[PDB]
Amino acid sequence: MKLHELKPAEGSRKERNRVGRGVATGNGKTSGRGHKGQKARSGGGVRPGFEGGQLPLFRRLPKRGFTNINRKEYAIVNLDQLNKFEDGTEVTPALLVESGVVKNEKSGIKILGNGSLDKKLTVKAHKFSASAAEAIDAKGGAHEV
């Protein structure tokens, strides 16, 4: 609108709450911090996890399992993300990354049958499951690894 009558969205901006500025505000003097103790001291308080002396929760439970850095992650793709183009052919990773249905291929492309293909297009990815191939076989595509 004008620069001398502009108004913001309703309930979009609010005023900040200032503590210690009177007794009518209801947050003065003590400023909602109690009376005494170690939680009312400037910059006081225990570490996030301290039990006050009792053994911490993450100290009684034992650890187990390694990490195995060398891990192969495959971009999971459903069967409902392949029915975007009718009468498709040769759905390679290069045509899938530029399709917008998949991006940043971690290390290959695995297909998982979650829905119905509802088409007879030729598939061609890295590897599939024991159902994906079956669905592709029913369609008529030459799924090659």
Partner: protein, 205 residues
């Protein structure tokens, strides 16, 4: 949608170049954030004060801890002392942020449409002066009856249109690529060139 090209009264090839850029519904929530962020990056954080560990001196205890009958002090540059020592004062920082590209375009198209639905748009024909003549631009604006505040639009780098009509109270010059949401919301009328009238219809279309 049917605008009429003009040139000192004379009407030229009427151009109906106006679809989703002009005559659309403007947003009153995406136009407020576009103006609040426009003047937010036009601020310079050049303000600072000295704290308790910045004032000169104040390293020796004033008197004894107890046995004098006075308040227990620690330094001569404390915050409650007249010497100095601010607590939480201002500090050098920036006030500029960012917003989604989609919103940036919406707000830009939400301002031009408002100027087209308020009879404040005027698509004139290509114009060029041999030398920056402020008097020549004075009579030029006198013919095209408009408001005090205006905002001429340039196509590329009109040096004769930039140097001239720049020292006028209530007049601003800019290019199609340099179209903001503050200068367009500060003016009352718009004067874009026919050639630069379709250039903004493609970049914002």
């Amino acid at each position: 949608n049917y605008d009429v090209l003009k040139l000192d009264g004379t009407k030229s090839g009427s151009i109906e170049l106006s679809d989703a850029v002009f005559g659309i519904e403007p947003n009153n929530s995406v136009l407020f954030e576009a103006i609040n962020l426009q003047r937010a990056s036009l601020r310079q954080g050049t303000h600072a004060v000295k704290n308790r560990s910045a004032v000169s001196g104040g390293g020796r205890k004033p008197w004894k801890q107890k046995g004098t009958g006075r308040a227990r002090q620690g330094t001569i540059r404390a915050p409650q002392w007249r010497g100095g020592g601010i607590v939480f004062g201002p500090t050098p920082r920036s006030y500029a942020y960012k917003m989604p590209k989609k919103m940036r375009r919406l707000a830009l198209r939400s301002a031009l449409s408002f100027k087209a639905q308020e009879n404040g748009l005027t698509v004139v024909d290509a114009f060029n002066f041999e030398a920056p003549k402020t008097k020549e631009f004075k009579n030029v604006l006198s013919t095209l009856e408009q408001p005090k505040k205006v905002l001429v639009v340039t196509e590329n780098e009109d040096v004769n249109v930039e140097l001239s009509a720049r020292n006028i109270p209530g007049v601003q010059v800019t290019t199609a690529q340099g179209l903001n949401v503050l200068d367009i919301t500060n003016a009352d009328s718009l004067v874009i060139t026919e050639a630069a009238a379709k250039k903004v219809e493609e970049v914002l279309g």
